[PDB]
Design a protein around this motif. Structure first.
Motif, PDB file in Angstrom:
ATOM      1  N   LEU A 126       0.836  -1.194   0.000  1.00  0.00           N
ATOM      2  CA  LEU A 126       0.000   0.000   0.000  1.00  0.00           C
ATOM      3  C   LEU A 126       0.873   1.246   0.000  1.00  0.00           C
ATOM      4  O   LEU A 126       1.653   1.465   0.934  1.00  0.00           O
ATOM      5  CB  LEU A 126      -0.934   0.006   1.210  1.00  0.00           C
ATOM      6  CG  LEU A 126      -2.372  -0.461   0.975  1.00  0.00           C
ATOM      7  CD1 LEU A 126      -2.411  -1.939   0.629  1.00  0.00           C
ATOM      8  CD2 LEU A 126      -3.230  -0.168   2.194  1.00  0.00           C
ATOM      9  N   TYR A 150      -0.248   5.161  -0.651  1.00  0.00           N
ATOM     10  CA  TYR A 150      -1.302   6.104  -1.004  1.00  0.00           C
ATOM     11  C   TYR A 150      -0.737   7.278  -1.792  1.00  0.00           C
ATOM     12  O   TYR A 150       0.312   7.828  -1.442  1.00  0.00           O
ATOM     13  CB  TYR A 150      -2.019   6.612   0.246  1.00  0.00           C
ATOM     14  CG  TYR A 150      -2.811   5.561   0.988  1.00  0.00           C
ATOM     15  CD1 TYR A 150      -3.703   4.735   0.317  1.00  0.00           C
ATOM     16  CD2 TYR A 150      -2.689   5.414   2.362  1.00  0.00           C
ATOM     17  CE1 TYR A 150      -4.436   3.779   0.992  1.00  0.00           C
ATOM     18  CE2 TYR A 150      -3.419   4.460   3.046  1.00  0.00           C
ATOM     19  CZ  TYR A 150      -4.290   3.647   2.355  1.00  0.00           C
ATOM     20  OH  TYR A 150      -5.020   2.696   3.033  1.00  0.00           O
ATOM     21  N   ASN A 151      -1.435   7.657  -2.858  1.00  0.00           N
ATOM     22  CA  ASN A 151      -1.093   8.869  -3.586  1.00  0.00           C
ATOM     23  C   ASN A 151      -1.381  10.085  -2.714  1.00  0.00           C
ATOM     24  O   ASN A 151      -2.435  10.169  -2.076  1.00  0.00           O
ATOM     25  CB  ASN A 151      -1.882   8.946  -4.892  1.00  0.00           C
ATOM     26  CG  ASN A 151      -1.337   9.992  -5.847  1.00  0.00           C
ATOM     27  OD1 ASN A 151      -0.419  10.740  -5.512  1.00  0.00           O
ATOM     28  ND2 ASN A 151      -1.904  10.048  -7.046  1.00  0.00           N
ATOM     29  N   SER A 207      -5.253  12.911  -0.931  1.00  0.00           N
ATOM     30  CA  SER A 207      -5.603  13.559   0.327  1.00  0.00           C
ATOM     31  C   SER A 207      -6.520  14.758   0.122  1.00  0.00           C
ATOM     32  O   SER A 207      -7.120  15.234   1.092  1.00  0.00           O
ATOM     33  CB  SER A 207      -4.338  13.994   1.068  1.00  0.00           C
ATOM     34  OG  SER A 207      -4.644  14.448   2.376  1.00  0.00           O
ATOM     35  N   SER A 259     -11.498   8.671  -0.293  1.00  0.00           N
ATOM     36  CA  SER A 259     -10.824   7.571  -0.964  1.00  0.00           C
ATOM     37  C   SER A 259      -9.872   6.800  -0.058  1.00  0.00           C
ATOM     38  O   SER A 259      -9.401   5.732  -0.462  1.00  0.00           O
ATOM     39  CB  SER A 259     -10.052   8.091  -2.179  1.00  0.00           C
ATOM     40  OG  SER A 259     -10.864   8.925  -2.984  1.00  0.00           O
ATOM     41  N   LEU A 260      -9.564   7.303   1.145  1.00  0.00           N
ATOM     42  CA  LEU A 260      -8.589   6.605   1.976  1.00  0.00           C
ATOM     43  C   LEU A 260      -8.951   6.592   3.461  1.00  0.00           C
ATOM     44  O   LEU A 260      -8.062   6.402   4.301  1.00  0.00           O
ATOM     45  CB  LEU A 260      -7.181   7.201   1.786  1.00  0.00           C
ATOM     46  CG  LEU A 260      -6.793   8.573   2.350  1.00  0.00           C
ATOM     47  CD1 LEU A 260      -5.281   8.716   2.357  1.00  0.00           C
ATOM     48  CD2 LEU A 260      -7.413   9.703   1.548  1.00  0.00           C
TER      49      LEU A 260
END
Lengths: 48, 48, 48, 49
Positions: free
Chosen positions: A21, A23-24, A28, A33-34
Protein backbone atom coordinates in the motif's frame (compact mmCIF):
# COMPACT_ATOMS: atom_id res chain seq x y z
CA UNK A 1 -26.96 -29.88 6.52
CA UNK A 2 -28.08 -30.62 10.07
CA UNK A 3 -27.28 -34.02 11.53
CA UNK A 4 -24.86 -35.04 8.78
CA UNK A 5 -21.48 -36.71 8.97
CA UNK A 6 -20.08 -33.35 10.10
CA UNK A 7 -21.33 -29.97 11.24
CA UNK A 8 -19.36 -27.99 8.65
CA UNK A 9 -16.83 -28.50 5.86
CA UNK A 10 -13.57 -26.61 5.42
CA UNK A 11 -11.46 -25.78 2.37
CA UNK A 12 -7.98 -25.63 3.87
CA UNK A 13 -6.53 -23.52 1.04
CA UNK A 14 -8.34 -20.64 -0.65
CA UNK A 15 -7.42 -17.39 -2.40
CA UNK A 16 -4.78 -15.53 -0.38
CA UNK A 17 -3.14 -12.23 -1.32
CA UNK A 18 -0.26 -10.01 -0.24
CA UNK A 19 -0.59 -6.27 -0.81
CA UNK A 20 1.74 -3.26 -0.89
CA UNK A 21 0.00 0.00 0.00
CA UNK A 22 1.35 3.38 -1.10
CA UNK A 23 -1.30 6.10 -1.00
CA UNK A 24 -1.09 8.87 -3.59
CA UNK A 25 -0.57 12.19 -1.81
CA UNK A 26 -2.92 14.06 -4.16
CA UNK A 27 -5.79 11.79 -3.05
CA UNK A 28 -5.60 13.56 0.33
CA UNK A 29 -7.60 16.33 -1.38
CA UNK A 30 -10.60 13.96 -1.22
CA UNK A 31 -10.26 11.96 2.03
CA UNK A 32 -13.21 9.67 1.15
CA UNK A 33 -10.82 7.57 -0.96
CA UNK A 34 -8.59 6.60 1.98
CA UNK A 35 -10.65 6.77 5.21
CA UNK A 36 -12.45 3.82 6.79
CA UNK A 37 -15.67 4.28 8.73
CA UNK A 38 -14.52 2.28 11.78
CA UNK A 39 -11.24 0.71 12.93
CA UNK A 40 -10.62 -2.78 11.56
CA UNK A 41 -8.14 -5.66 11.77
CA UNK A 42 -5.92 -7.51 9.30
CA UNK A 43 -5.64 -11.27 9.81
CA UNK A 44 -3.38 -13.11 7.37
CA UNK A 45 0.42 -12.88 7.24
CA UNK A 46 2.92 -14.42 4.82
CA UNK A 47 6.71 -14.66 5.17
CA UNK A 48 9.00 -14.96 2.14
CA UNK B 1 10.94 -36.05 -19.04
CA UNK B 2 8.15 -34.11 -17.30
CA UNK B 3 6.87 -37.37 -15.78
CA UNK B 4 10.36 -38.25 -14.53
CA UNK B 5 10.96 -34.80 -13.05
CA UNK B 6 7.52 -34.76 -11.39
CA UNK B 7 8.27 -38.10 -9.72
CA UNK B 8 11.68 -36.80 -8.61
CA UNK B 9 10.22 -33.60 -7.14
CA UNK B 10 7.54 -35.63 -5.35
CA UNK B 11 10.32 -37.75 -3.81
CA UNK B 12 12.43 -34.71 -2.83
CA UNK B 13 9.94 -33.13 -0.38
CA UNK B 14 7.65 -35.70 1.26
CA UNK B 15 6.49 -33.38 4.05
CA UNK B 16 5.09 -30.59 1.83
CA UNK B 17 4.30 -32.45 -1.42
CA UNK B 18 1.44 -34.93 -1.14
CA UNK B 19 1.56 -38.49 -2.43
CA UNK B 20 0.33 -39.20 -5.95
CA UNK B 21 -0.27 -41.98 -8.47
CA UNK B 22 1.23 -42.17 -11.99
CA UNK B 23 -2.26 -41.79 -13.50
CA UNK B 24 -2.64 -38.35 -11.91
CA UNK B 25 0.81 -37.33 -13.18
CA UNK B 26 -0.09 -38.48 -16.70
CA UNK B 27 -3.42 -36.63 -16.64
CA UNK B 28 -1.69 -33.46 -15.41
CA UNK B 29 1.02 -33.59 -18.07
CA UNK B 30 -1.56 -34.41 -20.77
CA UNK B 31 -3.81 -31.50 -19.80
CA UNK B 32 -1.12 -28.89 -20.57
CA UNK B 33 -0.21 -29.84 -24.15
CA UNK B 34 -1.11 -29.01 -27.76
CA UNK B 35 -4.54 -30.52 -28.06
CA UNK B 36 -4.01 -32.52 -31.25
CA UNK B 37 -1.97 -34.92 -29.11
CA UNK B 38 -4.64 -34.64 -26.41
CA UNK B 39 -7.39 -35.50 -28.90
CA UNK B 40 -5.63 -38.49 -30.45
CA UNK B 41 -4.57 -39.85 -27.05
CA UNK B 42 -8.10 -39.38 -25.70
CA UNK B 43 -9.52 -41.30 -28.66
CA UNK B 44 -6.93 -44.08 -28.28
CA UNK B 45 -7.50 -44.40 -24.53
CA UNK B 46 -11.27 -44.42 -25.06
CA UNK B 47 -10.90 -47.24 -27.60
CA UNK B 48 -8.44 -49.27 -25.50
CA UNK C 1 -44.30 -75.59 4.40
CA UNK C 2 -45.47 -72.50 2.50
CA UNK C 3 -43.85 -70.32 5.16
CA UNK C 4 -40.67 -72.41 4.98
CA UNK C 5 -40.38 -72.15 1.19
CA UNK C 6 -41.21 -68.43 1.27
CA UNK C 7 -38.48 -67.82 3.85
CA UNK C 8 -35.85 -69.80 1.94
CA UNK C 9 -36.82 -68.00 -1.28
CA UNK C 10 -36.41 -64.67 0.53
CA UNK C 11 -32.98 -65.74 1.82
CA UNK C 12 -31.92 -66.74 -1.70
CA UNK C 13 -33.21 -63.54 -3.29
CA UNK C 14 -31.77 -61.19 -0.68
CA UNK C 15 -28.13 -62.19 -1.16
CA UNK C 16 -27.95 -62.01 -4.97
CA UNK C 17 -26.33 -58.70 -5.92
CA UNK C 18 -23.38 -57.53 -8.02
CA UNK C 19 -21.31 -54.48 -7.12
CA UNK C 20 -20.86 -51.82 -9.79
CA UNK C 21 -19.07 -48.44 -9.56
CA UNK C 22 -18.75 -48.08 -5.79
CA UNK C 23 -17.99 -44.53 -4.56
CA UNK C 24 -14.36 -43.83 -3.69
CA UNK C 25 -12.22 -41.05 -2.25
CA UNK C 26 -8.60 -40.01 -2.77
CA UNK C 27 -6.45 -39.98 0.37
CA UNK C 28 -2.63 -39.86 0.61
CA UNK C 29 -2.42 -40.94 -3.02
CA UNK C 30 -4.54 -44.07 -2.46
CA UNK C 31 -8.19 -45.02 -2.88
CA UNK C 32 -10.39 -45.28 0.21
CA UNK C 33 -14.00 -46.37 0.64
CA UNK C 34 -16.72 -43.79 1.39
CA UNK C 35 -18.67 -44.67 4.63
CA UNK C 36 -21.89 -45.82 2.93
CA UNK C 37 -20.47 -48.66 0.80
CA UNK C 38 -19.55 -50.82 3.80
CA UNK C 39 -22.47 -52.12 5.84
CA UNK C 40 -21.88 -50.32 9.14
CA UNK C 41 -24.14 -47.53 10.39
CA UNK C 42 -22.85 -45.42 13.29
CA UNK C 43 -24.67 -42.07 12.97
CA UNK C 44 -25.95 -42.07 16.55
CA UNK C 45 -22.64 -42.60 18.39
CA UNK C 46 -20.62 -39.82 16.72
CA UNK C 47 -22.13 -36.76 18.51
CA UNK C 48 -21.95 -38.43 21.94
CA UNK D 1 7.15 -22.54 -33.30
CA UNK D 2 9.07 -23.06 -30.06
CA UNK D 3 10.93 -19.72 -29.80
CA UNK D 4 10.25 -16.11 -30.72
CA UNK D 5 12.24 -13.17 -32.09
CA UNK D 6 11.96 -9.76 -30.44
CA UNK D 7 13.36 -6.26 -30.85
CA UNK D 8 13.45 -5.20 -27.17
CA UNK D 9 13.85 -7.34 -24.03
CA UNK D 10 10.89 -7.51 -21.68
CA UNK D 11 10.86 -5.13 -18.72
CA UNK D 12 11.96 -6.71 -15.45
CA UNK D 13 12.46 -4.11 -12.69
CA UNK D 14 10.51 -0.96 -11.88
CA UNK D 15 10.50 1.72 -9.20
CA UNK D 16 8.06 3.48 -6.89
CA UNK D 17 8.62 6.77 -5.05
CA UNK D 18 6.76 7.50 -1.80
CA UNK D 19 6.84 11.28 -2.43
CA UNK D 20 10.23 11.29 -0.66
CA UNK D 21 13.70 12.01 -2.05
CA UNK D 22 16.29 9.90 -0.23
CA UNK D 23 14.99 6.40 -1.01
CA UNK D 24 12.64 4.57 -3.39
CA UNK D 25 11.27 1.04 -3.80
CA UNK D 26 12.57 -1.38 -6.44
CA UNK D 27 10.26 -4.24 -7.42
CA UNK D 28 10.62 -7.15 -9.85
CA UNK D 29 7.91 -7.76 -12.45
CA UNK D 30 8.84 -11.43 -12.96
CA UNK D 31 7.57 -12.38 -9.49
CA UNK D 32 4.26 -10.59 -10.12
CA UNK D 33 3.85 -12.29 -13.50
CA UNK D 34 4.63 -15.69 -11.98
CA UNK D 35 2.14 -15.07 -9.16
CA UNK D 36 -0.68 -14.02 -11.50
CA UNK D 37 -0.53 -17.14 -13.71
CA UNK D 38 -1.21 -19.83 -11.09
CA UNK D 39 -4.45 -21.28 -9.74
CA UNK D 40 -6.17 -22.24 -6.49
CA UNK D 41 -4.69 -25.41 -5.00
CA UNK D 42 -6.58 -27.93 -2.85
CA UNK D 43 -5.07 -31.03 -1.25
CA UNK D 44 -8.16 -33.09 -2.16
CA UNK D 45 -7.29 -33.23 -5.88
CA UNK D 46 -3.58 -33.87 -6.61
CA UNK D 47 -4.21 -33.54 -10.35
CA UNK D 48 -5.01 -29.82 -10.04
CA UNK D 49 -1.88 -29.28 -7.91
Amino acid sequence: ERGGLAYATIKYATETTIFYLIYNVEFSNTPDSLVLINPTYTMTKVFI
Amino acid sequence: VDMRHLSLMQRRFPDVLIQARPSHFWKAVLNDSPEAVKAVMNLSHSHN
Amino acid sequence: YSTIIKKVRFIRGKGSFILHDIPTRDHRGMEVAEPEVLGVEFKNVLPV
Amino acid sequence: QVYKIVKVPSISFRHIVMQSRDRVLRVDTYYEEMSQVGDVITEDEPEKF
